[PDB]
């Protein structure tokens, strides 16, 4: 499906109505599996961190660590299909220009690849950008073949602002997710009991990012 059609007929109206949008079968099986192979190779070759320190025990060998990350630019050897994913995300956002709220996206982060190792850790409730740092859209791509949350957990639970309900999103293979990064969307990752991979990119709003430079100072003489 052409990126522009997906953007105009789905992403734009969904984001303006719900602020949370799911695209299944984004890249297709072949490409999705190649991305999975690249992420697994990063893991198997030691490129991820050891994981977020969750619980400190008196014996440090018993410390519990959770999500593991690595930052990816997309041109690294062994990462070019991740790069292709990022370019595909960028093309979608570009086709949405000037239609996602009143935001004007002019840049993004590198990709944050995350691995929940399957040891019952998740991620606490949080907002991605609560303090005006420039990030307006979160884009996540999931890689987990035959993920079944009733068995393996790892649901992303989002709590759209001022709603008596939440939205549970399974981290399914070849699924792409968009949501507003600010306080519209507090969210959490429920405990994961199998290896769970995702790739996140954040897109910046031009105005917010420009004035974030002021708030968070950059020196000339
Ligand atoms: O993986 C998901 O479905 C949702 N994950 C997150 O919301 C998430 N958010 C943040 Cl800000 C971080 C931040 C650092 C490491 C992992 C994160 C993460 O998985
Ligand atoms: Mn988050």
Residue numbers in the entry: 188 to 404, 408 to 411
Give sentences copied directly from the paper behind this entry.
The ferrous iron and 2-oxoglutarate (2OG)-dependent HIF prolyl hydroxylases (PHDs/EGLNs) catalyse trans-4-prolyl hydroxylations on HIFα subunits, thus promoting their binding to the von Hippel–Lindau protein (VHL), a targeting component of a ubiquitin E3 ligase, and signalling for HIFα degradation under normoxic conditions. The PHD-catalysed hydroxylations of HIF-1α/HIF-2α in higher animals occur in amino- and carboxy-terminal oxygen-dependent degradation domains (NODD and CODD). The three human PHDs exhibit different NODD/CODD selectivities, with PHD3 being substantially more selective for CODD than PHD1/2 (refs 16). Biophysical analyses employing crystallography and NMR reveal that the molecular basis of PHD isoform and variant selectivity involves enzyme–substrate interactions involving β2/β3 loop residues (that bind the LXXLAP motif) and helices α3 and α4, regions which display sequence variations between the PHD isoforms.
Analysis of a PHD2.N-oxalyl glycine (NOG).CODD complex structure led us to propose that certain erythrocytosis-associated PHD2 variants (P317R and R371H) would have altered substrate selectivities. R371H PHD2 retains >60% NODD activity and is equally active as wt PHD2 with CODD in endpoint assays; kinetic analyses show R371H is less efficient compared with wt PHD2 (for R371H, kcat/Km is reduced by ∼50% for NODD and CODD). Structures of the P317R, R371H and R396T variants with a clinically used inhibitor628 reveal similar overall folds to wt PHD2, that is, a modified double-stranded-β-helix (DSBH) core (β-strands I–VIII), supporting 2OG and His-X-Asp…His-mediated Fe(II) binding. The structures suggested that these variants probably manifest altered substrate binding, but do not explain how their differing NODD/CODD selectivities arise. Comparison of the structures rationalizes the selectivities of the clinically observed P317R, R371H and R396T variants. Arg371PHD2 (βVI-VII loop) apparently positions the Arg370PHD2 side chain in ODD binding: Arg370PHD2 interacts with both Asp395NODD (electrostatic) and Leu559CODD (hydrophobic); substitution of Arg370PHD2 with alanine did not affect CODD hydroxylation, but gave ∼35% reduction in NODD activity, demonstrating Arg370–Arg371 is more important in NODD than in CODD hydroxylation.
